Amino acid sequence: AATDTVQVGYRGTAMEQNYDHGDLKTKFAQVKLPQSPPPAGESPPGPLPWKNVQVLNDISIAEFNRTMIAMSTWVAGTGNCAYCHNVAAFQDDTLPNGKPLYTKIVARRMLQMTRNINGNYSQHVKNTGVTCYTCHMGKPLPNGLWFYSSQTDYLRHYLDRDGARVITQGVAPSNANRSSTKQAEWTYALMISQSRSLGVNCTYCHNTRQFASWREAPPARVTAYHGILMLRDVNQNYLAPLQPVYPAVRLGAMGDAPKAQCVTCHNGAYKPLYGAQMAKDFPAMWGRADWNGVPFPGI
Amino acid sequence: MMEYIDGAQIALYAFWLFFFGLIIYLRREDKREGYPLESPQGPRDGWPKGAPKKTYVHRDHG
Amino acid sequence: GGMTEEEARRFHGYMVTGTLGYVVVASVAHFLAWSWRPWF
Amino acid sequence: GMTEEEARRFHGYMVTGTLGYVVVASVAHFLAWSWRPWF
Amino acid sequence: GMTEEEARRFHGYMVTGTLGYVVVASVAHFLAWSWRPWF
Amino acid sequence: MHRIWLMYDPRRVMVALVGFLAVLALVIHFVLLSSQRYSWIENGTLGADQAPVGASAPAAAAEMSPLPPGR
Amino acid sequence: MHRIWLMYDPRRVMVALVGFLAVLALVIHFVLLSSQRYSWIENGTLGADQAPVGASAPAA
Amino acid sequence: MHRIWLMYDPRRVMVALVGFLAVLALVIHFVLLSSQRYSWIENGTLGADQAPVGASAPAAAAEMSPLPPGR
Amino acid sequence: MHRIWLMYDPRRVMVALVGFLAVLALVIHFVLLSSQRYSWIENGTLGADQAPVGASAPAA
Amino acid sequence: HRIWLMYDPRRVMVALVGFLAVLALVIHFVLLSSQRYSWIENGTLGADQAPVGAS
Amino acid sequence: TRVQVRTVPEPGIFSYLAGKFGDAQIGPIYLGWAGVLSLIFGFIAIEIIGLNMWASVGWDPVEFIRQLPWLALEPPPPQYGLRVPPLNQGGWYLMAGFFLTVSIILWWIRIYRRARALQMGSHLPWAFASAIFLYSTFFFQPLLVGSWSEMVPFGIFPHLDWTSAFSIRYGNLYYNPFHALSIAFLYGSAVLFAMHGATILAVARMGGEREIEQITDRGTAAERSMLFWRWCMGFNATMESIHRWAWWFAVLTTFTGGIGILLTGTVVDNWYLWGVKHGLVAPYPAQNQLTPEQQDLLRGRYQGTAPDSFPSYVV
Amino acid sequence: AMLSFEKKYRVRGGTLIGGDLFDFWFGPFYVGFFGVTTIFFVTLGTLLCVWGAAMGPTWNLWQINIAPPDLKYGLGLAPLREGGLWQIITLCALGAFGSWALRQAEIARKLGMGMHIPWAYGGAILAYTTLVVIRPFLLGAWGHGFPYGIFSHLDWVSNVGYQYLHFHYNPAHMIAVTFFFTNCLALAMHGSLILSVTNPPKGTPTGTSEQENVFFRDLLGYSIGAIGIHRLGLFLAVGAAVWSAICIVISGPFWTQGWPEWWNWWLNLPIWK
Ligand SMILES: CCCCCCCCCCCCCC(=O)OC[C@H](COP(=O)(O)OCC(O)COP(=O)(O)OC[C@@H](COC(=O)CCCCCCCCCCCCC)OC(=O)CCCCCCCCCCCCC)OC(=O)CCCCCCCCCCCCC
């Protein structure tokens, strides 16, 4: 019933984050206790035996096996190789019936997506990085899935739209900015969603005396902006084109593929998994030559 | 053209001149009773000088 | 004023009869509701 | 204000209505227990 | 006002009613402790 | 028992009673109407076996690892 | 014990009694209706073994 | 000790007493109902060994924190 | 039963009754109009075998 | 003691009882909010299992 | 208290007089022709708003009550500017706004005529005219910026959504000096009525609430009221002139408010930057610093149109 | 100097503490013991404000900003340059505001008035004490108080509001605003009615209680009476400050989510859940 407070700005500005202490302990325990333990590494020699491996070309055979154990733990349950594979023939991309193993097709794309996130969007995920667990939480469906609805849905800021600014960078009115008050309402709706997705308030990213200011805002605002650019890449190039792959039970009413948003990783916390650092333990997923100076164990 | 001057600043000083004019008016009205003041050095009006005492006429029933 | 006791008996006789008649039609309403879609 | 004669007659009804209510509520609880016990 | 005649009889009812209530509550705690003890 | 009507105005108790019964009847209908099992205006034509039922305890480990929906 | 009805007016008390019981009964029904275990309008036809139960201690 | 009623009006004491006991009873029931261990409506059927117990301590990974970094 | 009109002024009763009935009827019509099955202004011509029905049990 | 001649016992009794009730509730809620003495959730723990603050 | 008198024949020479104070009829609550028309026009405005709100939940009467404070009758889309919009896209809004505005003006006339009929000064209709002035700036400022989309939506929480978004769009309304002045008069109105109400109740034992007698024939209740404030804070009003202080503080709330709205988006588009220009903004240490590459990277776009298609990404 | 009727009233008595020792006037001002303590706290607090301005970046009146300490100091007294100066000024403010209310009580007692004015002013002191004492104490740091600066405290109000995403949805804030707006209407209405009977159009008799009663009844549909309108004004103005105190003390100590999602209870009433 006590309130925890974190100061995030200068004295007396009231740039502060408030947390109900009992609720936060509960949410935190419900992450730590289910947090999956990682198997330890190895370093064997030799050339690769694989028949139909297309992304994980660059890691040892032991690292590959350890990765597959992690993926099943993170998406399907600790032993559930049958979720993706014809267990009689791991190289298959089809069932014995000939029908495609769509989960394996998706998982191959999810590997490329995760390497793209960790490699190209280090300005967002830094050295925490993401793994399959960050979205999936041990389950096939992440949180925060969204589909086409109406034209003015603000979640399309994370897909095809660009531009949320409404404030004028000058004293006098000009033709440079003709933003409506309705557009300020739309940005305000978008920004409530981001605040809720992280379990923070507006002062985490702004000094609300001037929402346009970057100098007065905490550095987290710059990280947040890279999160928008990352989601546009993730949605447009990886999640949305999987439309022909899924069964129709996964698709929206418009027949579109499920798309991600801030809450999909963050799940209401200021960092995903309260900043648990798992990606450093799984070189298969880095998309980098080194993780925090630790070099990639190539082949 | 004038950079520092702008219409919001012009409007605000127009309001200030009106507002101080209004405070003077109200303080004149506040002195229709109890003035001039008594003092050991003689009568005193303060500032602004009060408006005069005001006589009221009542509706004739005769 | 108030109620005289012979009026109170007359009123009570109606009031109790009305109450029970209401409960009777509510009983049939539950009989019909139960046979259409029982809740236990 | 009331007489003791009336208070006697009132208390008889009052206690009897309390008993009737407690009886019905006891049947209601045993039905509920039989359907879905809470311990 | 209150008399000594009222007061001594009233104290009998209060004390007996208080102790009766505390006895019923004692059984309720006996039951609760048997179901899910708190120490 | 009739002497209760000496204790209370028989004219006014009737207004209090009908007001109570009307409010209770409306409350129960609107509680039912908002439910899923008894949203009778949409689903009243369903037979009792095919009417909705609320979620149930898994009666098992609640742990058996999933399998994907067939493509 | 009927002497208690020389202290307190039956007119006042019987109104207060009916009011208290009606409020208490209504509070309990809505508390139960909001629970998972006893959301009887949706789930009243489930058997006792099928009805929800809150989470146990894992102890591990 | 009965002279306490010469000081305090018995008719009024009963109303104060019942009011205190009613509030206290409701406060204790709602405190217990809000707890994990005694949320008896949902979990009353659990055995005493299966009912929740508070932790001997909470735990964490060294890089995790429940609160964002501040100053 | 006509002595009941000695106990209640029909000037008062009928105004209350007409007010109640009008409000109740309007509520019922609008509850129907906003449903899927009885949105008769848009769908009144459909014919009973192809009017909407709310979803049968998820366990289907 | 003659102190009851200074202060009305009929007032002090009520003031004392009210003070004790406030103090008693404060201490119970302080303890209930602590880690070590949150007895409703953790009362069945043994004294060597119960929480202790950092050394 | 609890010795009320009750007067069976008519007070004014419980019950009320039917009669005349010259031109003024006494008895019924006065409407006249302007009052009747005001109620007709205003009723149609209320009906249009409510029927649009109720239609927006698909006529569902349960959702109409459940969702009521979120329901809106919403102004036209921005790209129409001042042109007539489609009926479902703000045409009903402008129609309700028109009838509401006429109804308000007819109510002002009704009040103005009644004051003159009762042979009273015109102070109340000019006070009401200050409130109407602020109201009208929610028409004139959208007009001056050139789009009815900028108008206030009819709705409990929706008009508060607009109030926040207006301050956001124009760069924090706290730095608008006429908003700041309007708040000073709003708070001052609470200060004055607290002080005055408490003053008159403090001398009510001495007949101080008979304020008109105390104005025309100063009693000891007036003298004690003046001396309390003179002894407390060094200056005082009179029993009359305290009502002038009251009148002006209330009137200046909405008058300075209206000027602040009319200036916004027409003369100043970012009030915080106007505050910086004019020296209002207190300095704080920098919370972040951008590199020159970030100054180009972190500029966004101004918000545009919503996507009118559902792209496939067939790849 | 004295009002032409004043000298008659300047008697001894009605003091609370000082007896006859401070029971005197200085110009128009009554002194008394709480006059002495008032001027002490006013002078100390003002000079420490001027010192806070002097060690700050500018003398510009609008930009001066004496800020509270960082939250890390909890309920301790911080270093003076780090916000301990704000804490001393806050104690001086409480001393001044309390002394002012007690001085008003001595003045009312000397004039034979009721205590309505001191108690009405207590509503403002309650709101101030909630902002700088009670809410910071419940949150566990004096650093939650608002900064002393003409615009910098508006930056604080802005950021506190957005700590709850959409502060307009705070239910106690909605009530407090309604009291403030209704008060201002009521003040315009009462002020206009008194002035318009006492200043009728030129060549017209002075109006009467009956005329303002007639007109007021046409405005609201009921007659409030002369004492009733002053009770109403006091109720509205003081109720506004009390509901203001409630609306801020529930924000943080008791509610910590966005204010919009507080309304989830209304959407889930069982008649329509
Ligand atoms: C003027 C020409 C230009 C004009 C254009 C610009 C200004 C327009 C306004 C002009 C107003 C009149 C000024 C004036 O000279 O007044 C003399 C009179 C004193 O009473 P009196 O009846 O007239 O005279 C009797 C006296 O002469 C003889 O009796 P005695 O010998 O016993 O008196 C001792 C004297 C000594 O005289 C003085 O000390 C004069 C002090 C004037 C101080 C003004 C400060 C203003 C700047 C503050 C900046 C801040 C410093 C911290 O009298 C006294 O003891 C003084 C009693 C008055 C105490 C006033 C206390 C402060 C009032 C509020 C201050 C503003 C708050 C925002 O004092 C007063 O009446 C002052 C209070 C009246 C105005 C209150 C207005 C409040 C508006 C609040 C809303 C603001 C919204 C934004």
Ligand code: BCL
């Ligand atoms: C003033 C008249 C009396 C009365 C006098 C009788 C008599 C006499 C008989 C019954 C009988 C019956 N009554 Mg009875 N009954 C009254 C009030 C009620 C109320 C009520 C809500 O108050 C109810 C639910 C009943 C219900 C019943 C049935 C259980 C039973 C079988 C007949 C039937 O179906 O009647 C259906 C009717 C209703 C549910 C409501 C209307 C009741 C009417 C006013 C009763 C009189 C008509 C009578 C039944 C006609 C046939 C019998 C004649 C002697 C020829 N009565 C009133 C207070 N009732 C019969 C019985 O026990 O048979 C074994 C029987 O012989």
Ligand code: BCL
């Ligand atoms: C995030 C939100 C923004 C903000 C945005 C705005 C905006 C936008 C406006 C204000 C305005 C005002 N704000 Mg601001 N405001 C904020 C912060 C504050 C704070 C604070 C402690 O933080 C306070 C005290 C205030 C206070 C005030 C008032 C001084 C002022 C309104 C005066 C008035 O009486 O209006 C109430 C009176 C009226 C609206 C007049 C109504 C008269 C008409 C005639 C009534 C007709 C009734 C009709 C017939 C009834 C039927 C209607 C139908 C049901 C539809 N603001 C922040 C910075 N504020 C206004 C202003 O003047 O700005 C300069 C304004 O427009």
Ligand SMILES: CC[C@H]1c2cc3[nH]c4c(c3C)C(=O)[C@H](C(=O)OC)c4c3nc(cc4[nH]c(cc(n2)[C@@H]1C)c(C(C)=O)c4C)[C@@H](C)[C@@H]3CCC(=O)OC/C=C(\C)CCC[C@H](C)CCC[C@H](C)CCCC(C)C
């Ligand atoms: C000085 C600034 C303050 C101010 C002042 C003020 N307001 C005022 C006045 C004054 C001095 C008035 O004299 C005037 C008034 O009448 O007061 C009672 C008014 C007024 N201030 C109002 C509101 C108001 N004031 C506000 C604010 C303010 N008022 C400021 C704070 C606010 C806010 C804060 O938002 C509001 C909402 C109104 C109560 C009133 C003006 C009433 C008016 O114009 O009504 C027009 C008519 C309608 C809305 C239509 C009603 C329709 C009926 C409900 C239908 C019923 C059916 C009908 C009978 C059918 C027709 C049949 C015919 C045959 C009759």
Ligand SMILES: CC[C@H]1c2cc3[nH]c4c(c3C)C(=O)[C@H](C(=O)OC)c4c3nc(cc4[nH]c(cc(n2)[C@@H]1C)c(C(C)=O)c4C)[C@@H](C)[C@@H]3CCC(=O)OC/C=C(\C)CCC[C@H](C)CCC[C@H](C)CCCC(C)C
């Ligand atoms: C409770 C309902 C409303 C109310 C009522 C009210 N106010 C009152 C009274 C009443 C009934 C008085 O009797 C009393 C009075 O005497 O009025 C003339 C007063 C009063 N209301 C005042 C102001 C005031 N009231 C406000 C609000 C309100 N007053 C409420 C809305 C506000 C707001 C909202 O901002 C202000 C500014 C004063 C004019 C006066 C009290 C005078 C007093 O206490 O004097 C002694 C103290 C000083 C002269 C100066 C003290 C200086 C400090 C030691 C240092 C500065 C510290 C301060 C915290 C700095 C703040 C800086 C700001 C930029 C943030």
Ligand SMILES: *[C@H]1O[C@H](CO)[C@@H](O[C@@H]2O[C@@H](C)[C@H](O)[C@@H](O)[C@H]2O)[C@H](O)[C@@H]1O[C@H]1O[C@H](C(=O)O)[C@@H](O[C@H]2O[C@H](CO)[C@@H](O)[C@H](O)[C@H]2NC(C)=O)[C@H](OC(C)=O)[C@H]1OC(C)=O
């Ligand atoms: C699913 O289908 C794919 C091919 O579509 C099979 O993949 C094999 O291994 C890959 C490395 C290789 O690239 C690919 O060419 C293929 O050799 C995968 O093993 C699964 O196979 C089963 O389904 C096959 C299918 O395509 O439907 C089926 O193939 C046979 O039958 C289809 C008609 O139903 C006919 O078009 C094929 O020509 C025919 N091919 C063969 C080699 O028989 C497989 O049947 C057999 C015996 O292989 C299925 O395999 C099994 C064990 O059931």
Ligand SMILES: *[C@H]1O[C@H](CO)[C@@H](O[C@@H]2O[C@@H](C)[C@H](O)[C@@H](O)[C@H]2O)[C@H](O)[C@@H]1O[C@H]1O[C@H](C(=O)O)[C@@H](O[C@H]2O[C@H](CO)[C@@H](O)[C@H](O)[C@H]2NC(C)=O)[C@H](OC(C)=O)[C@H]1OC(C)=O
């Ligand atoms: C569907 O179409 C609309 C309307 O163009 C697109 O909305 C545009 O982009 C939004 C982000 C923005 O908010 C909105 O103002 C509007 O500018 C929407 O995103 C969808 O886009 C796809 O379809 C576009 C289309 O118009 O058909 C298509 O646009 C290209 O092709 C059309 C001809 O079919 C031509 O008129 C356009 O100029 C052309 N634009 C570009 C930038 O090439 C999009 O194609 C591309 C590459 O953008 C479609 O986008 C995708 C990923 O399918």
Ligand SMILES: COC(C)(C)C/C=C/C(C)=C/C=C/C(C=O)=C/C=C/C(C)=C/C=C/C=C(C)/C=C/C=C(\C)CC/C=C(C)/C=C/C=C(\C)C(=O)O
């Ligand atoms: C979610 O879990 C939570 C809920 C939180 C857990 C907590 C639970 C808690 C704290 C529960 C508390 C329970 C409680 C505490 O008091 C319960 C107490 C209940 C009581 C007292 C019930 C009493 C009922 C009595 C009745 C119905 C009497 C009827 C009388 C009748 C019919 C007589 C009519 C006739 C008359 C009068 C004629 C008179 C004659 C006359 C006039 C003549 O003859 O003249």
Ligand SMILES: COC(C)(C)C/C=C/C(C)=C/C=C/C(C=O)=C/C=C/C(C)=C/C=C/C=C(C)/C=C/C=C(\C)CC/C=C(C)/C=C/C=C(\C)C(=O)O
């Ligand atoms: C969340 O957990 C937290 C809260 C944190 C934990 C902490 C909790 C704390 C601190 C709890 C403290 C509890 C407490 C402390 O003392 C509790 C004290 C309780 C007490 C004193 C109970 C007393 C009950 C007495 C009763 C029921 C008496 C009934 C009397 C009857 C029936 C007689 C009626 C007869 C009459 C009227 C006839 C009169 C004669 C007549 C008419 C005649 O003679 O004519």
Ligand SMILES: COC(C)(C)C/C=C/C(C)=C/C=C/C(C)=C/C=C/C(C)=C/C=C\C=C(C)\C=C\C=C(C)\C=C\C=C(C)\C=C\CC(C)(C)OC
């Ligand atoms: C069957 O009857 C029912 C049940 C429907 C009746 C019930 C109705 C209900 C429940 C109604 C509820 C109404 C509510 C809750 C309303 C809330 C309103 C609020 C809070 C409004 C707040 C602010 C609104 C403002 C400031 C609007 C201002 C609009 C203006 C100034 C518009 C002016 C337009 C003009 C002057 C002219 C337009 C026409 C032109 C000249 C442009 O020509 C096209």
Ligand SMILES: CCCCCCCCCCCCO[C@@H]1O[C@H](CO)[C@@H](O[C@H]2O[C@H](CO)[C@@H](O)[C@H](O)[C@H]2O)[C@H](O)[C@H]1O
């Ligand atoms: C739409 C309804 C459909 C379901 C059926 C409802 C059945 C209702 C049963 C009504 C039976 C009426 O039967 C009986 O009527 C008589 C008068 O006729 C009432 O009689 C009442 O008034 C008479 C005087 O006239 C008194 O002497 C008597 O003590 C009193 O009870 C009874 O109280 C009622 O029991």
Ligand SMILES: [Fe+3]
């Ligand atoms: Fe007055």
